[PDB]
Amino acid sequence: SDNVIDIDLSEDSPENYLLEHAVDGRMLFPATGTLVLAWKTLAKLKGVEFEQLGVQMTNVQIHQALFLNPGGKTTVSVSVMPITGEFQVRDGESLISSGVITSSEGRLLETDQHMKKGSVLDGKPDKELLFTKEIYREFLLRGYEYGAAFQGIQRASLDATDTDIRWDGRWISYLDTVLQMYLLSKPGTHQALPTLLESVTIDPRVHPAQPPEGTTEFQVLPGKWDPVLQIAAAGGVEIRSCHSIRASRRLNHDPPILEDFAFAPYVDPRPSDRSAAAVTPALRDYADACFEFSRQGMKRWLENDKNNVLPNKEEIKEALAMANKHANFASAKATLEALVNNKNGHRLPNHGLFEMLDIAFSEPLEGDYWDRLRMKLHDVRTYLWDDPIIAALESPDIVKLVMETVSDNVNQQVMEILEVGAARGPYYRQAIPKALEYFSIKDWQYTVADQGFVEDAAEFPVKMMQFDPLDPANFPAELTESCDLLVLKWNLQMQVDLDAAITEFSKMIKPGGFLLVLENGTRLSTFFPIKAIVSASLGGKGGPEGDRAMGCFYTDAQWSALFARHGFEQIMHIPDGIAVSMFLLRKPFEPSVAPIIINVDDLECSWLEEVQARCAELQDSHKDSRLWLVANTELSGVLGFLRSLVWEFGSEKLRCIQIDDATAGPNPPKISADSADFKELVRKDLAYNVFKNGKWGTYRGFVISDADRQKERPSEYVYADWLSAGDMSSLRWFDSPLKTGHNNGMLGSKMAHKLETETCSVYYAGLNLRDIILANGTIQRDILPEETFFKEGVLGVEFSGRNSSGKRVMGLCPPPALATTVKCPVSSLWSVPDQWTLEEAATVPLAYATAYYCLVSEGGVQKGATVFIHAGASVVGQASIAVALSYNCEIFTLTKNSDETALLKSMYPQLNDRNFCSSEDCSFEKYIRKETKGSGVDVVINTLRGKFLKASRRLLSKKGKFVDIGFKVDSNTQIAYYTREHPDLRFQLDALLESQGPEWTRLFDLVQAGIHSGVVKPLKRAVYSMDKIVDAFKTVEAEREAGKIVIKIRDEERQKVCPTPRTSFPAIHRTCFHPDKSHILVGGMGGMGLETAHWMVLRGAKKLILTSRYGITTGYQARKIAFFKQLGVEVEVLALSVNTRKAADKVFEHALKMGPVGGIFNMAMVLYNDDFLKMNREQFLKPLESKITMTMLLDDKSREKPVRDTLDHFVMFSSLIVSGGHLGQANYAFGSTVLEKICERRKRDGLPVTTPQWASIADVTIICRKYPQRFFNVLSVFDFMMSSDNVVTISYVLVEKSMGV
């Protein structure tokens, strides 16, 4: 109604600096931006200029975020009430800001900061100051992305109390930079969204005037932060008591792609290898069931074919005959139907062969049968494509192994693929989404072809060609030297003349190209039923390799011999065993010049000179010349070294061979110049040859499914948390830090109260409405007592289990008590009487402890007093009635429906209908007022809100007490809590459980007395298992029926004092660090070193020894370490390099002095990026110290006592240069690969090891087409990396799934 403000976010608009304010990518209008709009509006109403008006905004509520849009116009309406000052910044019909704006002519500013002239941060060292780069690195790590316009704090002290704030004449920027001082005063990791600014005073009269026009250098105004009063004051501005709400950090990019950098054999993989077919025992049964169903179905087909309408009948007799050689229809369908309809967990994704076979046989034998059935099976063709038998060889691992192995060997930038016959047997639907969509460095061009248009390929980035696939000699001549890979899925089995087809197919292969063939090789009579009805000319000439089975099938052994006969080298061969087989072939390579071999075994790089010389003469030699970098040791970086060399010398000549001594079989290869094994390798001319586990293979990064990141495994200690805040359907069970004996969150205020705690094995956990309110996002974790801020979880307080002595106990503990083990203070533990089962005990503690607090501790109930209890059917309501009845009180209670009234009356026989009202209307006020003869109710236990809260205070007597325990308080109510106007009694039982002082021990004794006197009786309850935790929370939230919801953790033993059996629970991973052990962080005084150290501090670590070449040299390092120490962490910063045994000894002398060594981290990096041929040894061994010398001096020291037994984690950070390669970083690649080989040796010896292989990290742009990850997401995958069995995990984010060219 009042001023309408238009914000022009255009190319040259003066208010374009407002797009330089983003939170996790999204552009936002600053929270202190509606203050200026309200400020400018009030001055406009008064008719005065806004910079001559001194305003004061009080209790400014931020309800929404005004999302700015580039090149767009945002119109917001500001409405100010003339006399009272109530203002409203509202975009459209949605409120963005509310509060009260008041102008004045006197002095409004409280602090005297506007009088301060200079900057007190003068003459200080550079290690005692924070600069704009360091200040806004801390904000970026929390999601606050400020552009150059909003980077106002130009310098600050380590405490951030004193700052230099820039004045540029823009008031939205200046107010934001004065709120950044408050944000800079609350170090942490989460993103805090302001929600209430109690006071904001702007006095431009004492503020410096706008800088002259065209100013380039602006003045810095001193700023100060007052912790006593919580005032951020700079210049003529003052922000007081800003309240923020935790915000879930959203991911700017798409989820990272996690892979397992593992070794994969080429030919005939064993069942334990990753290139092997994924045939489970269940699949081998489905294959047999289909085989029996197919075999007998043909028998049924032959005998019933009395009309002779079954062409290929001789073929169906031959197929039936062979099945008999290698061997009722009702039973055959019975076995399959039992397999299909069973849901025993072991369940194939789908049963397509059975489904499509059933259509093949069940179809009647009559006129127009074959034409109709051929149409029917062409309508369910998808079943054959997507079938466990057919998908065993189309698994993501094999598809990626083939597609990337072929890419490592194609020496172009685009990789031309050609899938001939894409209508019958398709491969694009598997190659594209599983392997080719992950490509970042190489481009791919896919070309499907067939007789007709490929209907299913319309949605894929492929090119559809047209010609006859089933007939050679008509292949278009435009396909000569056309494709670097040829895929013939189910094509060579349809060719009448194989030699002619293969000869004509081999011409389409570029020199050095590959041919991929997938054909049936075993149990050839299983799929024949469908190749009988859905094939026209089932006749194919045989040859020297034998006679085609039926007329369209060769056996796997005959397939391999046939390919070998045409001079094809078997690069890879993966037999499914149950059905299909896969061959990858390329033509033999005959060198014209002798290959050059250089041994790169030495880790001191005594060959840098020779390789550099031979690498220089690459582009002046014959095209058939090759450099073979050979390593015969487990530790060698030849694999990642040759990837980086390929980036500047091409893939044409650079080849490599590694032989792993440790796992090389009894017959190790003998690669040495004119050897026998080498020549077999100079003929395949594969870039990377690795002999490990007894077979030649290659290192490939196998993608990890997003479902495996939340895979649940047995865990002795678990606790319930949420995967996503505010979602009650995301509740899971995570690993509990109690496996270390202690509980996360021992920092700050939790370090002051040294409560004596008894470790109890939880058997039942009661679900209260306090947990549902937190779980569903109605209230953030920050409203809870400050002692719970760093706790792993905040769900659950009450429980009933067994203490360490085996006694049955029940009690309330600080969260998480929705767990399997707790550390309950001895002053909060009651003993279960020997008449209650532990199930009944789980319902008593909180319900009655709250009831006594509300009635006898806060309400001061006296004998005979009148009490009004809202929601009498709730557990707290039932407890309140029982406590009140014991005090001989006149009870009035609000019951929703008649079922609740009946339940309460039966539960408490003293309750008559006169004692009951309805929670559906405020008609209880007249009834209660009349029934009390105008005296009112002495105590009101209020849960209902709005007009029921008002109508219930109105019933209070002269001395009556109002106990409001509802959770969903209004905004005005919360401000009353903040302003100390009213006490917040809804998280007081949680606060008394942190202090456990005089006020609690009064409630402990009141409840204990009630148990003895019989007042405290167990309530009716519903027991939910540990897997229905989500459903239990939903049951509590809905409040459809009265009762206590109690999660059953363990089964109570028949005895009464007996040790709890040790058991495991399925739970998601959650890495935790032992607080009594010392964790060494070599290079932990850096970007990821210090931000990872903070992550460990939250997850349990309390003893850090951080190592650097120089120690603390900046004010960001000194401010972080002063934050760990304040939290209660024993930090130690050593200015040494662990490059000699003396240095290694010192770092572990200091570690063992602090405590047993429980973790070693190596984040150290040194980089000299340069061209390989302009690098001497002194410059090639630069990155090799932090990665080859500090990793075997930390690995030698971790393999000796006492480190070996105590050590839990051995993390050696790596880079994707070992998996992708990079330009100029050929020395870093060698160091990063030898580091990964030391970590794989540790796994061989059973020692703990983790090797993160990160691409790029944002907070601590697009390189090789990969977006840098946000650190809050690097620590999310890092946590999964530590709690996993693989050694090397590759984490990288893709800008977008790769398309063609």
Ligand SMILES: NC(=O)c1ccc[n+]([C@@H]2O[C@H](COP(=O)([O-])OP(=O)(O)OC[C@H]3O[C@@H](n4cnc5c(N)ncnc54)[C@H](OP(=O)(O)O)[C@@H]3O)[C@@H](O)[C@H]2O)c1
């Ligand atoms: N953040 C990224 O962009 C990114 C991307 C991919 C991978 N990574 C991985 O993460 C690490 C790099 O993280 P970052 O550079 O952001 O932070 P950082 O690892 O903490 O930084 C490297 C640190 O190494 C220390 N250092 C070097 N040589 C040392 C020696 N001989 N002894 C002890 N300390 C030594 C340096 O301490 P001084 O400075 O005091 O000498 C420096 O602070 C590497 O392991 C890398 O593989 C990071």
